[PDB]
């Protein structure tokens, strides 16, 4: 697990709507 | 598991709608 | 499992619609 | 399983529509 | 299973439509 | 199974249409 | 099964149409 | 776990709507 | 755990709506 | 089965049309 | 079965049309 | 130019060294 | 040029060394 | 040029070394 | 040039070494 | 040139070494 | 030239070594 | 030249070694 | 030249070694 | 030359060794 | 020359060894 | 020359060995 990146998500929705809104800008000169 | 990257997602929706909205920009000079 | 990359997703939808919206730009000079 | 890459997906939809929308650009000079 | 790459997908749709939309560009100089 | 690459897909559709749309470009100089 | 590459697909459609659309370009110099 | 980055999220919603709204801009010259 | 970044969130909502509103701007010359 | 490459496909369509569309280009110099 | 390459396909269509469209180009210098 | 993001940088150094040092952390729950 | 993103950089160094050092972390739950 | 993304870089170094160092992490749940 | 993406780089080094170092991670659930 | 993607690179090195180092990870669920 | 993708690279090295190092991973579910 | 894809590379090395190192993985479900 | 794909490479090495190293994997389900 | 695919390569090596190393896998279901 | 596919290669090696190494797999179901 | 496919190769080796190594597999169902 030295470089291990463990991700766990459990999702349960009844009559539901998910709206994840993400704007990202990254310019390096 | 030295470089192991474990990802687990469990999904269950009844009459549902998922809207993941992602904008990403990355220019490096 | 030294370089193992385990991915598990379980999906179950009743009368549902999935909309994963992803925009990605990556130019390196 | 030293280089093993295990992927498992279980899908079940009743009267459903899937819309995975992915835009990717990658030019390296 | 040292280089084993196991992929399993189970699909079942009733009156359904699948739309996987993927755009990929990769030029390296 | 040292270099084994096992792929299993089970498909069952009633009155359904599948639209897998893939664009890929890869030129290396 | 040392170099075995096992592929299994089971297909059953009632009044259905399959549209797998794949564009691939790969030139290496 | 020397470089381990463990993330765990458990989600359960009944008749719910999630609205994560994120605007990010980062240009460095 | 020398560079470990552990994040844990547990979420449970009954008839609820989440509105995380974030505006961020960062330009360095 | 040391170099065995086993492929099995079972197909059954009622009033159906299959359209597998594949474009591939590969020139190496 | 050391070099055995077993292929099995079962086909049954009622009022159906099959259109497998394949373009392949491979020149190596 | 409605969504146009124009970036121009002109750089000329004689016997010079550039050290842009940036640390950024952003976790939202 | 409605979505045009024009980037121009001109670089000329005599006996020079460039050190652009960037650390970025962004996890949203 | 409606979606045109024009990038131009001109590089000329005499006895020089370039060190662009970029660390980026982005996980959205 | 409606979707045109023009990239031009001109490179000339005398007794030089280029070290472009890029680390990128992007998992969306 | 409606979908034209023109890329031009001119390279000339005397006693030189090029080290383009790129790490990219992108899993979407 | 409506779908034309023109790529031109000119390379000339005296006593030189080229090391283009690229790692890419892309799994979409 | 409507679908023309013109590629030109000119290579000349004196006492030189070329090392183009490319790792690519792309599985879509 | 409507579908013409013209490729030209000119190669000349004195006491030289070429090492083009390419790994590609592409499974679509 | 409507479907013409012209390929020209000129090769000349003195005391040289060529090592073009290509691994490609492409299974579509 | 409407469907003409002209290929020309000129080869001359003094005390040389050629090693073109190509692995290709393509199964479509 | 409407369907003409002209191929010309000129080969001359002094104390040389040629090793063209090609593996190809193509099964379509």
From Swiss-Prot, chains A, B, C, D, E, F, G, H, I, J, K, L, M, N, O, P, Q, R, S, T, U, V:
Supply the induction statement: Release is stimulated by hypoglycemia and inhibited by hyperglycemia, insulin, and somatostatin.
Modified sites of kind Phosphoserine? 2
- Please list the tissues where expression of this protein has been recorded: Secreted in the A cells of the islets of Langerhans.
Q: Which domain of life is it from?
A: Eukaryota
Q: What does this protein do?
A: Plays a key role in glucose metabolism and homeostasis. Regulates blood glucose by increasing gluconeogenesis and decreasing glycolysis. A counterregulatory hormone of insulin, raises plasma glucose levels in response to insulin-induced hypoglycemia. Plays an important role in initiating and maintaining hyperglycemic conditions in diabetes.
UniProt-recorded name of the protein: Glucagon
Q: What is the gene called? A: GCG
